[PDB]
Symmetry: C2
Subunit: 341 residues, 2 copies
């Protein structure tokens, strides 16, 4: 156990892939804060402000809006096991297919708003069967309006555009979804993710809060500070900085002779950009170059987009033109130095 | 959003219920660090170090051991979904039967080591696959996963390990590993699918493929919690837990209170159940302790509900100073709360 008895040493990395993203000082300082009681009045009050914050960022007043004690995948699978009683795009459609398979004019349609695996900003208008929108990658960096756009179920992640640490996720349900869930003949296959249990604890029904599980208090400090941060900036201020940074990055990226994988600049998700791989180049070599020489994290592909693309993230405090300069200079070095057939 | 835009203010609270507990300087410093790639070489390294720690504190060598991205419930649910292809003690039994029902000479049995809802420690030497819940016991009372031939062992992060709540620890014997890698039917959970999670935690032969985003900061904090327990030593920790629980037991009986668990060999050191003094509202006692001592102690749980109070002694917090503080509080409570 010699390795475990050395002190923890974490290297400095600038994180500019699809996530997770570098944290700002307020959220880090929150992560370092002391514990409080996981059934105290003050935890409940912090949780009620988090509820307000979800209602702001999703643009809803659904009484049933809460935190999922797990990653974005967890908010999705919770949606599925709560709403199912036994369409594909990039990687997230495939994950919805595996979870749907695992359980058993369809009752529910899933759409990826921000396809971080393919870089595409799915159009949303009109599509409002219940509608499930994955906003893990989209939220905060692009317009999304739950109750205006007629979404039934909207879920998002903690660690993308909010720049909280990964491990909590955000979800909200329409009154339609809530009737589907609160009129099931079958119990969902999971206890951890049962919505009547999660709903009772998060204060969304008429009963006082019962013990279900122990919520992640410190992650909730960091998420509360994240939601206070995006609320102070403003939804449209964030949307604007993300569109401007995505335009600037596209500009420099084509300016180096690289080809943005999705043609229409209107169908490009600002938070995650996809870039086709320059011919006669090992994409692994180029990612390796960016980390090895500039401390900068860029991604390859994921699922279908694997081997076809590099992926770039512009998430909250990281969606800066200074970071776009650093990533451009790093890929410039990588193109001129990684061996070319 | 008036509330959200006030700055975060957390109260000073000394937490002495069944978990979670206050954090040490090291785990507050670990929680406050900067992000890194959730699939960088260093992330894998912190993950490999957490695995060695899960092996040390479980007393196993099972290659199939990893952290679960969820609370105690999530490790229990994950083991249950992965090893079941479709016995009751306190609250944790009811959770096991609830999950079992959710799916559908048995193949596996679940036993709680430290039943936190009753305060009963239970022997595992003597004891089909074996599943043991060590969420409250781990680090505070003897446990040897291999020597005691346990098939699935799990614990929680927010008890004696003193890590923040939200992670789980799990370990599988080669027997459970064969049961789970020879399933006709796929588990009902992808988030908790063991072949995927085993791959990502470096537990199989294939390079680590993307499954879910591990809670990077949670994992810094957990590595440290295991580094702290490894530095002290398991036997020193077990000792400190037994001595602190004996001290508390003594000071509690001194006040005219009667421990709910009479046989001291059947007393979990980490979490103490105390009978409710007759002619007392238990809520009044708990509220007076919070309001007037800034201290959390809890009531009962599940069957044990309305029958008991509970007092926790967890890792760095299981000190004689805290037994003294909680004794002085409950002293003041019995003399002021109204008594039929």
């Amino acid at each position: 156990l010699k390795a475990l008895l050395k002190p923890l040493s974490i290297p400095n990395q600038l994180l500019l892939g699809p996530g997770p993203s570098n944290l700002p000082p307020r959220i880090m300082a929150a992560g370092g804060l002391q514990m409080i009681g996981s059934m105290s009045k003050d935890m409940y009050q912090i949780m009620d402000e988090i509820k307000e914050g979800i209602q702001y960022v999703f643009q809803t007043r659904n009484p049933l809006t809460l935190v999922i004690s797990g990653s974005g995948h967890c908010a999705l699978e919770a949606a599925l096991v709560n709403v199912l009683e036994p369409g594909a795009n990039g990687i997230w459609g495939q994950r919805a297919v595996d979870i749907g398979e695992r359980i058993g004019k369809p009752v529910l349609l899933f759409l990826t708003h921000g396809e971080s695996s393919t870089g595409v900003l799915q159009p949303l208008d009109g599509f409002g069967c219940l509608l499930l929108v994955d906003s893990v990658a989209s939220l905060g960096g692009t317009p999304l309006y739950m109750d205006r756009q007629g979404i039934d179920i909207l879920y998002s992640g903690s660690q993308k555009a909010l720049n909280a640490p990964p491990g909590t996720s955000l979800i909200s349900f329409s009154d339609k979804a809530k009737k589907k869930m609160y009129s099931r003949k079958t119990k969902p296959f999971s206890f951890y993710l049962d919505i009547k249990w999660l709903a009772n604890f998060w204060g969304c029904d008429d009963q006082p809060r019962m013990y279900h599980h122990t919520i992640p208090v410190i992650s909730l400090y960091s998420l509360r500070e994240s939601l206070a941060l995006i609320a102070e900036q403003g939804l449209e201020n964030s949307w604007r900085q993300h569109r401007e940074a995505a335009a600037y990055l596209h500009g420099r990226l084509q300016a180096l002779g690289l080809q943005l994988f999705v043609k229409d600049p209107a169908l490009r998700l600002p938070t995650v950009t996809t870039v086709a791989v320059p011919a006669g180049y090992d994409w692994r070599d180029i990612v390796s170059y960016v980390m090895d020489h500039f401390d900068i994290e860029i991604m390859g592909g994921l699922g279908p987009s694997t081997g076809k693309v590099l992926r770039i993230g512009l998430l909250g405090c990281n969606a800066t033109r200074e970071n776009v300069d650093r990533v451009t200079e790093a890929l410039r070095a990588a193109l001129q130095h990684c061996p070319k057939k």
